[PDB]
Amino acid sequence: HMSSGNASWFQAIKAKKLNTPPPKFEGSGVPDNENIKPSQQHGYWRRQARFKPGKGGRCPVPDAWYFYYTGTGPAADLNWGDTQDGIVWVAAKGADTKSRSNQGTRDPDKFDQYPLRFSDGGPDGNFRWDFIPL
Numbered sequence: 001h002m003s004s005g006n007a008s009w010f011q012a013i014k015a016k017k018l019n020t021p022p023p024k025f026e027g028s029g030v031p032d033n034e035n036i037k038p039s040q041q042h043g044y045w046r047r048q049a050r051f052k053p054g055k056g057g058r059c060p061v062p063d064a065w066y067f068y069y070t071g072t073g074p075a076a077d078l079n080w081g082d083t084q085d086g087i088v089w090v091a092a093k094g095a096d097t098k099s100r101s102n103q104g105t106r107d108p109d110k111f112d113q114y115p116l117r118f119s120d121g122g123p124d125g126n127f128r129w130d131f132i133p134l
Contacts, residue, residue, distance in 0.1 A: 006074060007108035008066035011116050013045075013129045015063040022047070022088050023065060026121030029090025031067055031114075033103075040101045042080055042091030043069035065127075071100040092120075 010031050013023070023029075023045055030041045045065040051058035065088065066073075070080045080097040081089055091097055106114070115132035 007106040009106040011113040020126040024124040028092035045088035047086035
């Protein structure tokens with residue numbers, strides 16, 4: 001239906017300009033989650049290219065990146081650390097990168113988008129994301 005949905009648990013992080021580089025995170029790079037062990041705070045950022053309706057096919061609007069924990073999501077067969085185009089590897093300090101959760105991916109039918117908080121800092125200057133309640 002939607003990408004083996006596979007909907008990310010958490011709201012996107014849109015990019016500011018076009019041609020923004022892969023995100024730099026200050027600290028963990030890992031969204032705050034109440035239902036998760038400090039040991040299990042690790043995952044990846046996937047770059048999803050967007051388009052706007054228009055003249056030629058469609059229109060390349062700026063990039064976006066979603067969050068999935070290691071072993072969940074459209075690159076779940078990768079170990080944490082695997083170098084790949086379009087993925088940014090993050091993990092909180094002192095986290096079992098050999099562990100795996102069983103949180104999976106958001107079933108958009110419907111667990112609504114999950115608000116993105118980031119107590120240890122956040123992504124760099126080239127990225128933003130809407131405010132969501134809570």
